[PDB]
């Protein structure tokens, strides 16, 4: 395998600083063109910074003078140290290995969401979407968890620690907090027997909530 494993991210206050890193396998950061690329919500891909094997660095106009791309050869790691962050820096950030000085990117990190906001972290409240006749369709039934009032994104939802699952995109409410539903379709014959538990992980708040979802008449 050839890969980049990214670390860092999350909520940061405007004016603050934040560092991202990526560990490479199957190539050496010291001998490659490496870059960071970002993508604001709903928008396209924009290069942030590039570093050459010989050490030269280049920056997008929007970040020049306040972001630094760097590397640790003996740890095979790439870094992005950001400063003077603003709301317009909110984006998913990816590290990348480039085949050419100006792009051609074969290896991408998985991405991490950086949210620049003065609002406080808030953990989700998790409420059951209980199965009933009104959520039953013959041999199948729907049940879920409402994951309400959290900030920032993302939240992770798993079931019983996998099929039939629809976790919906979060919506931003007027309060400025996010809300999401996760639903699963299960055999209607199991509603009385099988325990269904949604596991909600909101890393920015270090909140982990398991909620058992039980039927209603």
């Amino acid at each position: 395998e050839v890969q980049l494993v990214e670390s860092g991210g999350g909520l940061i206050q405007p004016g603050g600083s934040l560092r991202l890193s990526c560990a490479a396998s199957g190539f050496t950061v010291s001998s490659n063109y490496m870059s960071w690329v970002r993508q604001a919500p709903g928008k396209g891909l924009e290069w942030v910074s590039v570093i050459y094997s010989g050490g030269s660095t280049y920056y997008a106009d929007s970040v020049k003078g306040r972001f630094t791309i760097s590397r640790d050869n003996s740890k095979n790691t790439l870094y992005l140290q950001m400063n003077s962050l603003r709301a317009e820096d909110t984006a998913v950030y990816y590290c990348a290995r480039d085949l050419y000085s100006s792009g051609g990117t074969d290896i991408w990190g998985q991405g991490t969401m950086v949210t620049v906001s003065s609002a406080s972290t808030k953990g989700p409240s998790v409420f059951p979407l209980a199965p009933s006749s009104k959520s039953t369709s013959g041999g199948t039934a729907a049940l879920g968890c409402l994951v309400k009032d959290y900030f920032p994104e993302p939240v992770t939802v798993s079931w019983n620690s996998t099929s039939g699952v629809h976790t919906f995109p979060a919506v931003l409410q007027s309060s400025g907090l996010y809300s999401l539903s996760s639903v699963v379709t299960v055999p209607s014959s199991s509603l009385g027997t099988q325990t269904y538990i949604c596991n909600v992980n909101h890393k920015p708040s270090n909140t982990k909530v398991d909620k058992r979802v039980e039927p209603k008449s």
């Binding site: 396209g44 891909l45 924009e46 290069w47 280049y58 997008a60 990816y94 480039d98 085949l99 050419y100 000085s101 100006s102 792009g103 051609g104 990117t105 074969d106 991408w108 990190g109 998985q110 991405g111 409240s125 409420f127 059951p128 979407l129 209980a130 009933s132 009104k134 959520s135 369709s137 729907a142 879920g144 409402l146 309400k148 629809h166 976790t167 919906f168 995109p169 979060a170 919506v171 409410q173 809300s179 999401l180 539903s181 639903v183 379709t185 209603k216 008449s217």
Partner: protein
């Protein structure tokens, strides 16, 4: 900087069809230094093609690229349902490298009406002073659907929000959640809570409802 203009902006085609995506450059791109990427929702981009026409290792044979000068093309020779994504071109023949704005490929299928479910608020939530009522439209196509809430037969406005899933990677359907948010007090003052759904797969609109307390 070289500007890359992708067309069309959105492309909807059925499995088995040929898809042709264009990327036009504002000036000539040197050495066919152009790449194509696929980006699925929530994921990092995946390199498909580099050098305008070289398929990356491990990429299925249905993906191919061509072009030179100012016009480049990505072809999916026979679309598969898993191919919905945004596809981006990128030039690296002149500095700085630049990306197109993406073409969103959506997979067409035959019409599928939603199954409609409704969930009353939890007792746990009501103890907190708010009531969320959830209407689920499951596994439907096309994506356009009208969802209206009625409380004691009164059409609601300004108190609901919707979310739609990405297409299913096997059967190309969508699901949609609509959440009506009311105060506990308002919720307890009314009896009938109804979600009315209009969709092309239905012969007539469908209403799903419950009476508070059940």
């Amino acid at each position: 900087e070289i500007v890359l203009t992708q067309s069309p902006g959105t492309l909807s085609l059925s499995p088995g069809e040929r898809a042709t995506l264009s990327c036009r450059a504002s000036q000539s791109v040197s050495s066919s230094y152009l790449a194509w990427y696929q980006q699925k929702p929530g994921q990092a981009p995946r390199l498909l093609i580099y050098g305008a026409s070289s398929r990356a290792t491990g990429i299925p044979d249905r993906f191919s690229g061509s072009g030179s000068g100012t016009d480049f093309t990505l072809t999916i020779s026979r679309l598969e349902p898993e191919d919905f994504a945004v596809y981006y071109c990128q030039q690296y023949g002149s500095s700085p490298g630049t990306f197109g704005q993406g073409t969103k490929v959506e997979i067409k299928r035959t019409v599928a009406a939603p199954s409609v479910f409704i969930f009353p608020p939890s007792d746990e939530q009501l103890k907190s002073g708010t009531a969320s009522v959830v209407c689920l439209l499951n596994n439907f196509y096309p994506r356009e659907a009208k969802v209206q809430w009625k409380v004691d037969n009164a059409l609601q406005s300004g108190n609901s929000q919707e979310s739609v899933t990405e297409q299913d990677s096997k059967d190309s359907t969508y699901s949609l959640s609509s959440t009506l948010t009311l105060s506990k007090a308002d919720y307890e003052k009314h009896k009938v809570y109804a979600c009315e759904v209009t969709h092309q797969g239905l012969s007539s609109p469908v209403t799903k409802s419950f009476n508070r307390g059940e």
